CSV table of C-alpha atoms and ligand atoms in Angstrom, one decimal:
chain,number,residue,atom,x,y,z
Y,1,UNK,CA,0.1,0.0,0.0
Y,2,UNK,CA,1.3,3.3,-1.2
Y,3,UNK,CA,1.7,6.3,1.5
Y,4,UNK,CA,0.0,8.7,-0.9
Y,5,UNK,CA,-3.2,6.7,-1.5
Y,6,UNK,CA,-5.1,5.1,1.5
Y,7,UNK,CA,-6.7,1.8,0.7
Y,8,UNK,CA,-10.2,3.2,2.0
Y,9,UNK,CA,-10.2,5.6,-1.0
Y,10,UNK,CA,-12.7,4.0,-3.3
Y,11,UNK,CA,-11.8,4.9,-7.1
Y,12,UNK,CA,-15.2,3.4,-8.1
Y,13,UNK,CA,-17.4,5.6,-5.9
Y,14,UNK,CA,-20.2,7.1,-7.9
Y,15,UNK,CA,-20.2,10.2,-5.5
Y,16,UNK,CA,-16.4,10.9,-6.2
Y,17,UNK,CA,-16.8,10.3,-10.0
Y,18,UNK,CA,-19.9,12.5,-9.9
Y,19,UNK,CA,-17.4,15.4,-8.9
Y,20,UNK,CA,-14.5,14.1,-11.0
Y,21,UNK,CA,-12.3,11.3,-12.4
Y,22,UNK,CA,-9.7,10.4,-9.9
Y,23,UNK,CA,-7.0,11.1,-12.7
Y,24,UNK,CA,-4.2,12.2,-10.2
Y,25,UNK,CA,-4.8,9.4,-7.7
Y,26,UNK,CA,-4.6,6.9,-10.6
Y,27,UNK,CA,-1.3,8.6,-11.7
Y,28,UNK,CA,-0.1,8.1,-8.2
Y,29,UNK,CA,-0.7,4.3,-8.2
Y,30,UNK,CA,1.0,4.0,-11.7
Y,31,UNK,CA,4.5,5.4,-10.2
Y,32,UNK,CA,4.1,3.7,-6.7
Y,33,UNK,CA,1.6,0.7,-6.8
Y,34,UNK,CA,0.3,-0.1,-10.3
Y,35,UNK,CA,-1.6,-3.0,-8.8
Y,36,UNK,CA,-3.3,-2.0,-5.6
Y,37,UNK,CA,-5.9,-3.2,-3.2
Y,38,UNK,CA,-9.0,-1.2,-2.4
Y,39,UNK,CA,-10.4,-1.9,1.0
Y,40,UNK,CA,-14.1,-1.7,1.5
Y,41,UNK,CA,-14.7,-3.4,4.9
Y,42,UNK,CA,-18.4,-2.7,5.2
Y,43,UNK,CA,-18.9,-4.8,2.0
Y,44,UNK,CA,-19.1,-3.7,-1.7
Y,45,UNK,CA,-22.5,-2.8,-3.3
Y,46,UNK,CA,-24.0,-5.9,-5.1
Y,47,UNK,CA,-20.9,-8.1,-4.8
Y,48,UNK,CA,-20.8,-8.0,-0.9
Y,49,UNK,CA,-17.1,-8.8,-0.9
Y,50,UNK,CA,-14.6,-6.5,1.2
Y,51,UNK,CA,-12.8,-4.9,-1.7
Y,52,UNK,CA,-11.0,-5.2,-5.2
Y,53,UNK,CA,-7.8,-5.0,-6.9
Y,54,UNK,CA,-7.2,-2.0,-9.1
Y,55,UNK,CA,-5.0,-2.3,-12.1
Y,56,UNK,CA,-3.6,1.1,-13.5
Y,57,UNK,CA,-0.7,0.2,-16.0
Y,58,UNK,CA,-1.7,-0.2,-19.7
Y,59,UNK,CA,0.6,-3.5,-19.9
Y,60,UNK,CA,-1.0,-5.1,-16.9
Y,61,UNK,CA,-4.7,-4.2,-18.2
Y,62,UNK,CA,-3.7,-5.8,-21.4
Y,63,UNK,CA,-2.5,-9.0,-19.6
Y,64,UNK,CA,-5.6,-9.2,-17.7
Y,65,UNK,CA,-7.7,-8.8,-20.9
Y,66,UNK,CA,-5.8,-11.4,-22.5
Y,67,UNK,CA,-6.0,-14.1,-19.8
Y,68,UNK,CA,-9.6,-14.8,-19.9
Y,69,UNK,CA,-8.8,-18.5,-18.9
Y,70,UNK,CA,-7.8,-17.2,-15.1
Y,71,UNK,CA,-9.6,-13.9,-15.2
Y,72,UNK,CA,-13.4,-14.6,-15.9
Y,73,UNK,CA,-16.3,-12.3,-16.8
Y,74,UNK,CA,-19.0,-14.5,-15.4
Y,75,UNK,CA,-18.5,-14.8,-11.7
Y,76,UNK,CA,-19.2,-11.1,-10.9
Y,77,UNK,CA,-19.9,-9.5,-14.5
Y,78,UNK,CA,-17.9,-6.9,-16.1
Y,79,UNK,CA,-19.3,-3.7,-14.5
Y,80,UNK,CA,-17.0,-3.0,-11.5
Y,81,UNK,CA,-19.3,-1.1,-9.0
Y,82,UNK,CA,-23.0,-1.0,-7.7
Y,83,UNK,CA,-24.9,1.1,-5.3
Y,84,UNK,CA,-25.4,-0.3,-1.6
Y,85,UNK,CA,-29.0,-1.1,-2.4
Y,86,UNK,CA,-28.0,-3.6,-5.2
Y,87,UNK,CA,-28.5,-7.3,-4.2
Y,88,UNK,CA,-26.1,-10.3,-4.8
Y,89,UNK,CA,-28.9,-11.8,-7.1
Y,90,UNK,CA,-29.0,-9.0,-9.6
Y,91,UNK,CA,-25.2,-9.0,-10.0
Y,92,UNK,CA,-25.3,-12.8,-10.7
Y,93,UNK,CA,-27.7,-12.7,-13.6
Y,94,UNK,CA,-25.5,-10.1,-15.4
Y,95,UNK,CA,-24.1,-13.4,-16.9
Y,96,UNK,CA,-27.1,-13.6,-19.2
Y,97,UNK,CA,-25.6,-11.2,-21.5
Y,98,UNK,CA,-22.6,-11.8,-23.8
Y,99,UNK,CA,-20.3,-9.1,-22.0
Y,100,UNK,CA,-20.4,-11.3,-18.8
Y,101,UNK,CA,-20.1,-14.8,-20.1
Y,102,UNK,CA,-17.2,-17.2,-20.0
Y,103,UNK,CA,-16.2,-20.0,-22.4
Y,104,UNK,CA,-17.6,-22.2,-23.6
Y,105,UNK,CA,-21.0,-20.3,-24.2
Y,106,UNK,CA,-19.3,-17.0,-25.0
Y,107,UNK,CA,-17.0,-18.6,-27.5
Y,108,UNK,CA,-20.0,-19.8,-29.4
Y,109,UNK,CA,-22.1,-16.8,-28.9
Y,110,UNK,CA,-19.4,-14.2,-30.0
Y,111,UNK,CA,-18.4,-16.2,-33.0
Y,112,UNK,CA,-22.1,-16.0,-34.3
Y,113,UNK,CA,-22.6,-12.6,-33.3
Y,114,UNK,CA,-19.3,-11.5,-35.3
Y,115,UNK,CA,-21.2,-12.1,-38.4
Y,116,UNK,CA,-23.1,-8.9,-37.6
Y,117,UNK,CA,-20.0,-6.7,-37.4
Y,118,UNK,CA,-18.5,-7.3,-40.5
Y,119,UNK,CA,-16.8,-4.6,-42.6
Y,120,UNK,CA,-19.8,-5.1,-45.2
Y,121,UNK,CA,-22.5,-4.9,-42.7
Y,122,UNK,CA,-21.1,-2.0,-41.1
Y,123,UNK,CA,-20.1,-0.3,-44.4
Y,124,UNK,CA,-23.7,-0.7,-45.7
Y,125,UNK,CA,-25.2,1.6,-43.0
Y,126,UNK,CA,-23.1,4.6,-44.0
Y,127,UNK,CA,-25.2,6.4,-46.4
Y,128,UNK,CA,-28.2,6.2,-44.2
Y,129,UNK,CA,-26.3,7.3,-41.2
Y,130,UNK,CA,-24.7,10.1,-42.9
Y,131,UNK,CA,-27.9,11.3,-44.1
Y,132,UNK,CA,-29.4,11.2,-40.4
Y,133,UNK,CA,-26.2,12.8,-38.9
Y,134,UNK,CA,-26.7,15.7,-41.3
Y,135,UNK,CA,-30.2,16.2,-40.3
Y,136,UNK,CA,-29.6,15.8,-36.6
Y,137,UNK,CA,-26.9,18.7,-36.7
Y,138,UNK,CA,-28.8,20.8,-39.2
Y,139,UNK,CA,-32.2,20.6,-36.6
Y,140,UNK,CA,-30.0,21.5,-33.8
Y,141,UNK,CA,-28.2,24.3,-35.5
Y,142,UNK,CA,-31.6,25.7,-36.5
Y,143,UNK,CA,-32.6,25.8,-32.8
Y,144,UNK,CA,-29.7,28.4,-32.1
Y,145,UNK,CA,-28.9,27.1,-28.8
Y,146,UNK,CA,-29.6,24.3,-26.6
Y,147,UNK,CA,-28.7,21.1,-24.8
Y,148,UNK,CA,-25.8,19.5,-27.0
Y,149,UNK,CA,-26.3,16.0,-25.6
Y,150,UNK,CA,-30.1,15.7,-26.3
Y,151,UNK,CA,-30.0,17.6,-29.6
Y,152,UNK,CA,-26.7,16.2,-30.9
Y,153,UNK,CA,-24.9,13.5,-28.9
Y,154,UNK,CA,-27.9,11.0,-28.2
Y,155,UNK,CA,-29.6,10.2,-31.5
Y,156,UNK,CA,-27.2,8.8,-34.0
Y,157,UNK,CA,-25.8,5.9,-31.8
Y,158,UNK,CA,-29.4,4.9,-31.2
Y,159,UNK,CA,-30.2,5.2,-35.0
Y,160,UNK,CA,-27.1,3.2,-35.7
Y,161,UNK,CA,-28.4,0.1,-33.6
Y,162,UNK,CA,-31.8,0.6,-35.2
Y,163,UNK,CA,-30.5,0.6,-38.9
Y,164,UNK,CA,-28.1,-2.4,-38.0
Y,165,UNK,CA,-31.2,-4.5,-36.7
Y,166,UNK,CA,-33.3,-3.3,-39.4
Y,167,UNK,CA,-36.0,-1.9,-36.9
Y,168,UNK,CA,-39.0,-0.3,-38.6
Y,169,UNK,CA,-39.2,3.4,-38.3
Y,170,UNK,CA,-42.5,3.3,-36.4
Y,171,UNK,CA,-40.9,1.1,-33.6
Y,172,UNK,CA,-37.8,3.2,-33.1
Y,173,UNK,CA,-39.5,5.6,-30.7
Y,174,UNK,CA,-40.2,2.7,-28.1
Y,175,UNK,CA,-36.9,1.1,-28.9
Y,176,UNK,CA,-35.2,4.2,-28.2
Y,177,UNK,CA,-37.1,4.7,-24.9
Y,178,UNK,CA,-36.3,1.3,-23.7
Y,179,UNK,CA,-32.7,1.8,-24.4
Y,180,UNK,CA,-32.5,5.0,-22.5
Y,181,UNK,CA,-34.4,3.6,-19.4
Y,182,UNK,CA,-31.6,1.0,-19.2
Y,183,UNK,CA,-28.9,3.5,-18.7
Y,184,UNK,CA,-29.6,4.3,-15.0
Y,185,UNK,CA,-29.2,2.7,-11.6
Y,186,UNK,CA,-27.7,5.6,-9.7
Y,187,UNK,CA,-28.4,9.2,-11.0
Y,188,UNK,CA,-31.5,10.8,-9.2
Y,189,UNK,CA,-32.7,12.6,-12.2
Y,190,UNK,CA,-33.4,9.2,-13.9
Y,191,UNK,CA,-35.0,8.0,-10.6
Y,192,UNK,CA,-38.4,7.3,-12.1
Y,193,UNK,CA,-37.4,4.8,-14.9
Y,194,UNK,CA,-37.9,1.0,-14.9
Y,195,UNK,CA,-34.7,-0.3,-16.4
Y,196,UNK,CA,-35.8,-4.1,-15.6
Y,197,UNK,CA,-39.4,-3.9,-17.4
Y,198,UNK,CA,-37.6,-2.0,-20.4
Y,199,UNK,CA,-35.2,-4.7,-20.7
Y,200,UNK,CA,-37.9,-7.4,-20.6
Y,201,UNK,CA,-40.0,-5.6,-23.3
Y,202,UNK,CA,-37.0,-5.2,-25.3
Y,203,UNK,CA,-36.4,-9.0,-25.1
Y,204,UNK,CA,-39.9,-9.7,-26.1
Y,205,UNK,CA,-39.6,-7.1,-29.2
Y,206,UNK,CA,-36.4,-8.9,-30.3
Y,207,UNK,CA,-37.5,-12.3,-29.9
Y,208,UNK,CA,-40.7,-11.7,-32.1
Y,209,UNK,CA,-38.2,-9.8,-34.7
Y,210,UNK,CA,-36.3,-13.0,-34.8
Y,211,UNK,CA,-39.6,-15.0,-35.4
Y,212,UNK,CA,-40.6,-12.8,-38.2
Y,213,UNK,CA,-37.2,-12.7,-39.8
Y,214,UNK,CA,-37.3,-16.5,-39.8
Y,215,UNK,CA,-40.2,-16.5,-42.0
Y,216,UNK,CA,-39.6,-13.3,-44.0
Y,217,UNK,CA,-35.7,-13.1,-44.2
Y,218,UNK,CA,-34.0,-9.6,-44.9
Y,219,UNK,CA,-30.6,-8.3,-45.6
Y,220,UNK,CA,-30.2,-6.8,-42.2
Y,221,UNK,CA,-28.0,-8.7,-39.6
Y,222,UNK,CA,-31.0,-10.4,-37.9
Y,223,UNK,CA,-31.3,-12.9,-40.5
Y,224,UNK,CA,-27.4,-13.6,-40.5
Y,225,UNK,CA,-27.7,-14.3,-36.9
Y,226,UNK,CA,-30.8,-16.5,-36.7
Y,227,UNK,CA,-29.8,-18.8,-39.6
Y,228,UNK,CA,-27.5,-21.7,-39.5
Y,229,UNK,CA,-23.8,-21.4,-40.9
Y,230,UNK,CA,-22.0,-24.3,-42.6
Y,231,UNK,CA,-21.9,-26.0,-39.1
Y,232,UNK,CA,-25.4,-25.4,-38.1
Y,233,UNK,CA,-24.8,-22.7,-35.7
Y,234,UNK,CA,-27.3,-20.1,-35.0
Y,235,UNK,CA,-28.9,-17.8,-32.4
Y,236,UNK,CA,-31.9,-19.2,-30.8
Y,237,UNK,CA,-34.8,-16.6,-30.4
Y,238,UNK,CA,-34.0,-16.0,-26.7
Y,239,UNK,CA,-30.2,-15.6,-27.5
Y,240,UNK,CA,-31.0,-13.2,-30.1
Y,241,UNK,CA,-33.2,-11.3,-27.4
Y,242,UNK,CA,-30.5,-11.1,-24.9
Y,243,UNK,CA,-28.0,-9.8,-27.9
Y,244,UNK,CA,-30.4,-7.1,-28.9
Y,245,UNK,CA,-30.5,-6.1,-24.9
Y,246,UNK,CA,-26.7,-6.3,-24.7
Y,247,UNK,CA,-26.7,-3.8,-28.0
Y,248,UNK,CA,-29.1,-1.4,-26.4
Y,249,UNK,CA,-26.6,-0.7,-23.5
Y,250,UNK,CA,-23.4,-1.3,-25.1
Y,251,UNK,CA,-23.7,0.9,-28.0
Y,252,UNK,CA,-25.7,3.8,-26.6
Y,253,UNK,CA,-24.3,5.7,-23.7
Y,254,UNK,CA,-20.9,4.6,-24.7
Y,255,UNK,CA,-20.9,6.4,-28.1
Y,256,UNK,CA,-23.0,9.1,-26.8
Y,257,UNK,CA,-20.7,10.0,-24.1
Y,258,UNK,CA,-17.6,9.7,-26.5
Y,259,UNK,CA,-19.2,12.2,-28.7
Y,260,UNK,CA,-20.0,14.9,-26.1
Y,261,UNK,CA,-16.6,14.6,-24.3
Y,262,UNK,CA,-15.1,14.8,-28.0
Y,263,UNK,CA,-16.8,18.2,-28.4
Y,264,UNK,CA,-15.9,19.4,-25.0
Y,265,UNK,CA,-12.1,18.6,-26.1
Y,266,UNK,CA,-12.4,20.5,-29.2
Y,267,UNK,CA,-13.9,23.5,-27.1
Y,268,UNK,CA,-11.0,23.2,-24.8
Y,269,UNK,CA,-8.6,22.8,-27.8
Y,270,UNK,CA,-9.5,25.3,-30.7
Y,271,UNK,CA,-6.4,24.5,-32.4
Y,272,UNK,CA,-7.3,20.7,-32.8
Y,273,UNK,CA,-11.1,21.8,-33.8
Y,274,UNK,CA,-9.7,24.2,-36.7
Y,275,UNK,CA,-7.5,21.3,-37.7
Y,276,UNK,CA,-10.4,18.9,-37.8
Y,277,UNK,CA,-12.8,21.1,-39.7
Y,278,UNK,CA,-10.0,21.6,-42.4
Y,279,UNK,CA,-8.6,18.0,-42.8
Y,280,UNK,CA,-11.1,15.6,-41.1
Y,281,UNK,CA,-8.4,13.2,-40.1
Y,282,UNK,CA,-9.1,9.3,-39.8
Y,283,UNK,CA,-7.1,9.2,-36.6
Y,284,UNK,CA,-9.5,11.7,-35.0
Y,285,UNK,CA,-12.3,9.1,-33.8
Y,286,UNK,CA,-9.6,7.1,-31.9
Y,287,UNK,CA,-8.1,10.1,-29.9
Y,288,UNK,CA,-11.6,11.0,-29.2
Y,289,UNK,CA,-12.2,7.6,-27.8
Y,290,UNK,CA,-9.0,7.6,-25.7
Y,291,UNK,CA,-9.7,11.1,-24.4
Y,292,UNK,CA,-13.2,10.4,-23.5
Y,293,UNK,CA,-12.7,6.7,-22.4
Y,294,UNK,CA,-16.5,6.3,-21.8
Y,295,UNK,CA,-16.2,2.9,-19.9
Y,296,UNK,CA,-13.6,4.3,-17.0
Y,297,UNK,CA,-13.2,0.6,-15.8
Y,298,UNK,CA,-14.6,-3.0,-16.3
Y,299,UNK,CA,-13.4,-5.9,-14.0
Y,300,UNK,CA,-12.8,-9.6,-14.1
Y,301,UNK,CA,-12.7,-12.3,-11.2
Y,302,UNK,CA,-9.8,-14.6,-10.5
Y,303,UNK,CA,-10.9,-18.2,-11.3
Y,304,UNK,CA,-7.6,-19.6,-9.4
Y,305,UNK,CA,-4.9,-18.2,-7.4
Y,306,UNK,CA,-2.4,-16.4,-9.7
Y,307,UNK,CA,0.3,-14.0,-9.9
Y,308,UNK,CA,0.1,-10.4,-11.5
Y,309,UNK,CA,2.8,-8.0,-11.7
Y,310,UNK,CA,4.4,-9.6,-8.8
Y,311,UNK,CA,1.2,-9.5,-6.9
Y,312,UNK,CA,-0.5,-12.5,-5.4
Y,313,UNK,CA,-4.1,-12.6,-6.3
Y,314,UNK,CA,-6.6,-15.1,-4.8
Y,315,UNK,CA,-9.4,-16.9,-6.4
Y,316,UNK,CA,-12.7,-15.1,-6.2
Y,317,UNK,CA,-11.0,-11.5,-5.7
Y,318,UNK,CA,-12.0,-9.1,-8.2
Y,319,UNK,CA,-9.6,-7.5,-10.5
Y,320,UNK,CA,-10.6,-4.0,-12.0
Y,321,UNK,CA,-9.1,-2.7,-15.1
Y,322,UNK,CA,-8.7,1.1,-15.0
Y,323,UNK,CA,-9.2,2.0,-18.8
Y,324,UNK,CA,-8.9,5.5,-17.9
Y,325,UNK,CA,-5.6,5.1,-16.2
Y,326,UNK,CA,-4.1,3.0,-18.8
Y,327,UNK,CA,-5.2,5.3,-21.6
Y,328,UNK,CA,-2.7,8.0,-20.0
Y,329,UNK,CA,0.1,5.5,-19.2
Y,330,UNK,CA,3.2,7.6,-19.7
Y,331,UNK,CA,5.3,4.5,-20.7
Y,332,UNK,CA,3.1,4.0,-23.6
Y,333,UNK,CA,1.6,7.3,-25.0
Y,334,UNK,CA,3.9,10.2,-25.8
Y,335,UNK,CA,2.7,13.4,-24.2
Y,336,UNK,CA,-0.7,11.5,-23.2
Y,337,UNK,CA,-2.3,14.8,-21.5
Y,338,UNK,CA,-2.4,16.5,-24.9
Y,339,UNK,CA,-5.4,16.1,-27.1
Y,340,UNK,CA,-4.1,15.3,-30.6
Y,341,UNK,CA,-6.5,14.1,-33.3
Y,342,UNK,CA,-3.7,13.1,-35.5
Y,343,UNK,CA,-2.2,10.7,-32.8
Y,344,UNK,CA,-0.7,7.8,-34.4
Y,345,UNK,CA,0.0,5.3,-33.3
Y,346,UNK,CA,-2.7,5.2,-30.6
Y,347,UNK,CA,-2.9,2.0,-28.6
Y,348,UNK,CA,-5.8,2.9,-26.4
Y,349,UNK,CA,-7.8,0.4,-24.4
Y,350,UNK,CA,-11.0,2.4,-24.5
Y,351,UNK,CA,-12.6,-0.3,-26.5
Y,352,UNK,CA,-11.0,-2.8,-24.1
Y,353,UNK,CA,-7.7,-4.6,-24.3
Y,354,UNK,CA,-7.2,-7.2,-27.0
Y,355,UNK,CA,-9.0,-10.6,-25.9
Y,356,UNK,CA,-12.1,-12.7,-25.7
Y,357,UNK,CA,-14.2,-9.6,-24.8
Y,358,UNK,CA,-12.8,-6.8,-27.0
Y,359,UNK,CA,-15.5,-4.5,-28.2
Y,360,UNK,CA,-17.3,-6.1,-31.3
Y,361,UNK,CA,-19.0,-2.8,-32.1
Y,362,UNK,CA,-15.6,-0.6,-32.4
Y,363,UNK,CA,-15.7,0.1,-35.8
Y,364,UNK,CA,-19.6,0.9,-35.8
Y,365,UNK,CA,-18.8,3.5,-33.1
Y,366,UNK,CA,-15.8,4.9,-35.0
Y,367,UNK,CA,-18.2,5.4,-38.0
Y,368,UNK,CA,-20.8,7.2,-35.8
Y,369,UNK,CA,-18.1,9.3,-34.3
Y,370,UNK,CA,-16.7,10.2,-37.7
Y,371,UNK,CA,-20.1,11.0,-39.1
Y,372,UNK,CA,-21.4,13.2,-36.4
Y,373,UNK,CA,-18.5,15.2,-36.3
Y,374,UNK,CA,-18.3,15.6,-39.9
Y,375,UNK,CA,-21.8,17.1,-39.7
Y,376,UNK,CA,-21.2,19.3,-36.8
Y,377,UNK,CA,-18.2,20.7,-38.7
Y,378,UNK,CA,-20.5,21.2,-41.7
Y,379,UNK,CA,-23.6,22.9,-40.2
Y,380,UNK,CA,-22.6,24.4,-36.9
Y,381,UNK,CA,-18.7,24.9,-37.2
Y,382,UNK,CA,-18.6,27.8,-34.8
Y,383,UNK,CA,-20.3,26.3,-31.9
Y,384,UNK,CA,-19.4,27.4,-28.5
Y,385,UNK,CA,-20.2,26.3,-24.8
Y,386,UNK,CA,-22.8,28.1,-22.9
Y,387,UNK,CA,-22.7,26.1,-19.5
Y,388,UNK,CA,-20.6,23.6,-17.8
Y,389,UNK,CA,-21.3,20.0,-18.5
Y,390,UNK,CA,-23.3,18.2,-16.0
Y,391,UNK,CA,-21.7,15.0,-15.2
Y,392,UNK,CA,-23.5,11.7,-14.7
Y,393,UNK,CA,-23.4,10.1,-11.1
Y,394,UNK,CA,-21.8,6.6,-12.0
Y,395,UNK,CA,-18.5,5.0,-10.6
Y,396,UNK,CA,-17.4,3.2,-13.8
Y,397,UNK,CA,-19.1,5.1,-16.8
Y,398,UNK,CA,-17.8,8.6,-17.6
Y,399,UNK,CA,-21.2,10.2,-18.6
Y,400,UNK,CA,-22.3,13.6,-19.2
Y,401,UNK,CA,-26.1,14.4,-18.7
Y,402,UNK,CA,-26.3,18.0,-20.0
Y,403,UNK,CA,-24.3,20.5,-21.9
Y,404,UNK,CA,-25.6,23.9,-22.9
Y,405,UNK,CA,-24.3,25.1,-26.1
Y,406,UNK,CA,-24.7,28.3,-28.5
Y,407,UNK,CA,-24.5,26.6,-31.9
Y,408,UNK,CA,-24.2,29.7,-34.1
Y,409,UNK,CA,-21.3,30.9,-31.8
Y,410,UNK,CA,-22.8,34.3,-31.5
T,501,LIG,C1,-17.2,4.6,-28.1
T,501,LIG,C2,-17.9,3.5,-28.2
T,501,LIG,C3,-17.7,2.2,-27.3
T,501,LIG,C4,-17.0,2.0,-26.3
T,501,LIG,C5,-16.0,3.0,-25.6
T,501,LIG,C6,-17.3,0.5,-26.0
T,501,LIG,C7,-16.4,-0.1,-25.0
T,501,LIG,C8,-16.6,-1.4,-24.9
T,501,LIG,C9,-15.5,-2.0,-24.1
T,501,LIG,C10,-14.3,-1.4,-23.1
T,501,LIG,C11,-15.9,-3.5,-24.1
T,501,LIG,C12,-14.9,-4.7,-23.4
T,501,LIG,C13,-15.9,-5.3,-22.2
T,501,LIG,C14,-14.9,-6.1,-21.1
T,501,LIG,O1,-13.8,-6.3,-21.8
T,501,LIG,O2,-15.4,-6.4,-20.2
T,501,LIG,C15,-16.8,-3.7,-25.0
T,501,LIG,C16,-17.5,-4.9,-25.3
T,501,LIG,C17,-18.7,-4.8,-26.3
T,501,LIG,N1,-19.2,-3.9,-27.1
T,501,LIG,FE1,-18.5,-1.9,-27.1
T,501,LIG,N2,-18.1,0.0,-26.9
T,501,LIG,C18,-18.5,1.1,-27.7
T,501,LIG,C19,-19.4,0.9,-28.9
T,501,LIG,C20,-20.2,-0.2,-29.1
T,501,LIG,C21,-21.2,-0.2,-29.9
T,501,LIG,C22,-21.5,0.7,-30.9
T,501,LIG,C23,-21.5,-1.7,-30.2
T,501,LIG,C24,-22.6,-2.3,-30.8
T,501,LIG,C25,-23.5,-1.6,-31.6
T,501,LIG,C26,-20.7,-2.3,-28.8
T,501,LIG,C27,-21.0,-3.5,-28.6
T,501,LIG,C28,-20.5,-4.4,-27.8
T,501,LIG,C29,-20.6,-5.9,-27.3
T,501,LIG,C30,-21.6,-6.5,-27.9
T,501,LIG,C31,-19.6,-6.0,-26.4
T,501,LIG,C32,-19.3,-7.3,-25.7
T,501,LIG,C33,-18.2,-8.2,-26.3
T,501,LIG,C34,-18.0,-9.4,-25.7
T,501,LIG,O3,-18.2,-9.4,-24.4
T,501,LIG,O4,-17.5,-10.5,-26.3
T,501,LIG,N3,-19.9,-1.4,-28.6
T,501,LIG,N4,-17.1,-2.3,-25.6
């Protein structure tokens, strides 16, 4: 235990992160105790254990990601922190979705699901999504000023999911509503949502979608997923249901928050914003994701006694990967605290470290990001912040709820 950071300091506390990301504190661990145990003697929310290991170095985060055979996702799920009213029961059924599964079921399911995220599948959405990105930006610009999150950041990630699944336009409203209801669990502004009922209804909708496409096939990814490959592999209707639920949370608030933090970074760095508007560099999306790191941390659970960075980890202890720390590791990134959209190479772990659970939607997210910022630069290139960004109350998701902006910059 380093003298500079006491073990009782909870890096994942939602109240702390509402105020700020513990950036300086993580930086301290990297110099003194890169693998660090956090004490929560009263019992952690949801899990009910007495603490967790925190991994702060880029190299060590990659090693954990790579060694799924000893660092599992199913005992406690990937999400590393829950409020105190969270039950052990709710934690232990996170395993019903891909993110929180281990081998062999994860191996089979990811292989099938990967059909939906080929270059062809993603690239075929580009025209429709660009069209929408433009109209999103134009509509916001016409308002003069307003909340950037709701008027610019929010819609395109949702539409991307919709266009990928081939959701009919008349159903997208309730789809978006359900998705947005599943993005709570701490913040008091969202205290009257029902995420459980929303997930239930979303599963139901998805299952019927699979049953319809089974009789009337289309050229969206749903048909690709529910039909047997050369080896007879396919998603059952319920599996597809839990896949859609997975998508609703995985590709919604993540991309949304990368866009908002992206624009904030551009506001704090006029030089880079001018550079983007003039050259539209392809490296921009990845520096945005590194800078935002929408997922601050995900965890694993040790399936057996194991040594990591000279530290003995005991079976059942949780191992939390700090993506936020790793993405600013001074041994990996040159000038990590400079926002540079031309950054190359850019080995960030914002989409996770290479391994079994590496983000399957990463290229879809990059496309979404590129399209919305191309549209912003095209329809509101002189936008300026009016108010301070209001942060989301979450211990692991680096979210922004609101950000008042003058689009015409007048
Ligand atoms: C900037 C946007 C995004 C970020 C930062 C992000 C981040 C991540 C991260 C860090 C993981 C690793 C989970 C772990 O190792 O425990 C992950 C997994 C995953 N992501 Fe993304 N994601 C983004 C966008 C998307 C989108 C747009 C989709 C789909 C439409 C998506 C679908 C998934 C799925 C299905 C998984 C689970 C894969 C598995 O467990 O095998 N993500 N994401």
